[PDB]
């Protein structure tokens, strides 16, 4: 079976900027597209299961743990729960000018441990191939690099595919993240037609991904820079403690304070 997890980056600052701009695309339509994708994923098979996480500047919250219109009961429950919870989360939110960058590493950590819990609980008879369909919507924060890299490596070890679906911006950190675990990287330039991209590129599971034509991976610039400048550097002088990429040879690296002996 397959356990899909949709990590939606519903950043109020950026989505409300879109709302003020009165652009055609809106967070409501984005949520509807994600809902349709999840419904289709479960539609694929009974054993398949899904979950949803929404990201905010403060924290990240799960959007998912009759036939009034003649509807499938389970998908109806999914629609109702996600709609109600997303509206509640968006309506209620404190204001903090100091912190405005969208948070994604914590949401991904929650997704990873949730997948681990489900893998533990599920019977050993059936093998579960989990996936994380990250949908970024705003620029990433520099300070989150370390934790995001930790969670990416944990996902690599635990065999989960991070399929990135960044839109309106190309996050180098996120493309690097999905490249490590082999997840697909699609940058949709037509936001209104986003759902067609999901039902083709992302929706097919790892089982059938190899035997299918999908957009080629984007080249990844594995840049390095010294802690002085944050500029690209091809040669780094790291020590045996900090393991930090530096500018030039120095008597002692500041982040270490070690008694380096010249020679």
């Amino acid at each position: 079976l397959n356990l899909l997890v949709i990590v939606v980056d519903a950043n109020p600052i950026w989505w409300g900027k879109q709302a003020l701009k009165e652009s055609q695309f809106t967070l409501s339509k984005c949520i509807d597209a994600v809902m349709v994708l999840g419904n289709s994923h479960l539609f694929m098979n009974r054993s398949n299961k899904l979950a949803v996480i929404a990201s905010h500047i403060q924290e990240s919250r799960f959007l998912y743990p009759g036939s009034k219109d003649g509807k499938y009961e389970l998908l109806t429950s999914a629609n109702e729960v996600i709609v109600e919870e997303i509206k509640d989360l968006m309506t209620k939110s404190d204001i903090k000018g100091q912190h405005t960058e969208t948070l994604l590493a914590g949401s991904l950590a929650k997704a990873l441990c949730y997948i681990h819990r489900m893998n533990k609980e599920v019977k050993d008879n059936q093998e579960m191939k989990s996936r994380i369909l990250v949908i970024k919507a705003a620029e990433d924060s520099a300070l989150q690099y370390m934790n995001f890299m930790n969670v990416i490596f944990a996902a690599q070890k635990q065999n989960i595919l991070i399929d990135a679906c960044v839109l309106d911006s190309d996050s180098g950190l996120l493309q690097q993240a999905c490249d490590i675990t082999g997840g697909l990287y699609l940058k949709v330039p037509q936001m209104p037609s986003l759902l067609q991209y999901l039902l083709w590129v992302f929706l097919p599971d790892q089982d059938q991904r190899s035997q299918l034509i999908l957009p080629p991976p984007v080249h990844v610039d594995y840049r390095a820079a010294c802690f002085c400048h944050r500029n690209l550097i091809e040669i780094g002088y790291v020590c045996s403690v900090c393991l930090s990429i530096f500018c030039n040879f120095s008597p002692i690296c500041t982040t270490c304070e070690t008694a380096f002996k010249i020679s």
């Binding site: 929650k110 441990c113 890299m149 490596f153 080249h219 840049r223 020590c239 403690v241 990429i245």
Partner: protein, 329 residues
């Protein structure tokens, strides 16, 4: 506590007759090799900059099964090949340690030279006394941490404690897994250990410039066919198939930023979360980590974020993720 991020480790395996004895459920040698494959892969996955080397000792002679390398697959293939090894003879600690010392003597001072002798047959027939070699080992600051099997060998006990390594004996297969997984992590740097800056090079993946114009065809550098694109070197300018790898010309380590980032969690260990069985005014039925009801009388909490985590959440966080999800916020 200072930790040596870069370490050249030699896993000395003994092809002694005693390995024939099937003390463990499968053959002893087969079990050791099967688990050592996992150890090698996990060691590379937890220390990309580091490198490993296997010396197989049998019939009083030690042979380098695989030289130092940064490619786990090559070592894994060597293990699979060695699974069928005859396993007849008697080991020689002097021979094995001398081979390891010969290879590690020219290694850089900054890196931590380490040896893990998986000792199976308690006997040690050597051409020369090993107590003399112990002095050279201490002078060369090569850490040696023996792991004995079904025997508390006295010479190896003194070897480990004098050279700074640790000595252990296998209680069972499950404890063997724990021992090797523990040895995976970098050892703390002691007073004798010294740190020094090491030259590093960061290559960038490159492909055909524009529609195969002014292309850079090349086959490989350690039956490789032509490659349209790949990794390169700042100085070698020689195409490399996979990273990280030591330069075949420069002698400088080529490694990308994520490989280095993989080792920061060692510098930043996660403080253990106090285990409180009682609810302790925790009215949140759903576990914050996994958003699942706490079916057991156990809770974990940090000293900063003060969040709630269940048994599985805490175990996974301290084992693999090496960072607290909510406490990241």
């Amino acid at each position: 506590v200072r930790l040596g991020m870069m370490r050249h480790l030699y896993v000395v395996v003994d092809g002694s007759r005693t390995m024939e004895d099937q003390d463990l459920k499968p053959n002893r040698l087969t079990c050791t090799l099967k688990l050592l494959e996992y150890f090698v892969e996990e060691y590379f996955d937890q220390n990309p900059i580091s490198q490993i080397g296997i010396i197989v000792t049998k019939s009083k002679r030690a042979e380098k099964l695989t030289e130092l390398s940064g490619n786990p697959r090559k070592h894994i293939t060597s293990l699979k090949k060695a699974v069928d090894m005859t396993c007849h003879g008697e080991p020689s600690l002097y021979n094995s340690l001398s081979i390891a010392m010969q290879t590690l003597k020219h290694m850089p001072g900054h890196t931590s030279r380490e040896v893990l002798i998986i000792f199976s047959s308690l006997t040690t027939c050597d051409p020369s006394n090993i107590y003399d070699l112990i002095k050279t080992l201490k002078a060369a600051k090569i850490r040696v941490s023996v792991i004995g099997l079904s025997a508390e060998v006295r010479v190896c006990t003194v070897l480990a404690r004098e050279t700074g390594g640790t000595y252990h004996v296998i209680l069972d297969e499950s404890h063997y897994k724990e021992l090797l997984t523990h040895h995976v992590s970098p050892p703390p740097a002691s007073s004798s250990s010294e740190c020094s800056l090491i030259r590093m090079g960061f290559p960038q993946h490159t492909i055909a410039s524009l529609s195969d114009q002014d292309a850079k065809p090349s086959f490989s550098m350690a039956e490789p066919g032509l490659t349209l694109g790949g990794y390169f070197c700042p100085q070698c300018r020689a195409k490399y198939c996979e990273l990280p790898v030591e330069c075949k010309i420069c002698g400088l380590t080529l490694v990308s930023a994520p490989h280095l980032a993989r080792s920061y969690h060692h510098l930043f260990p996660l403080d253990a979360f106090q285990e409180i069985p009682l609810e302790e005014y925790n009215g949140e039925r759903f576990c914050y980590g996994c958003q699942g009801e706490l079916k057991d009388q156990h809770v974990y909490v940090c000293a900063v974020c003060q969040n709630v985590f269940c048994v599985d959440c805490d175990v996974f966080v301290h084992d693999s993720l090496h960072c607290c999800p909510g406490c990241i916020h």
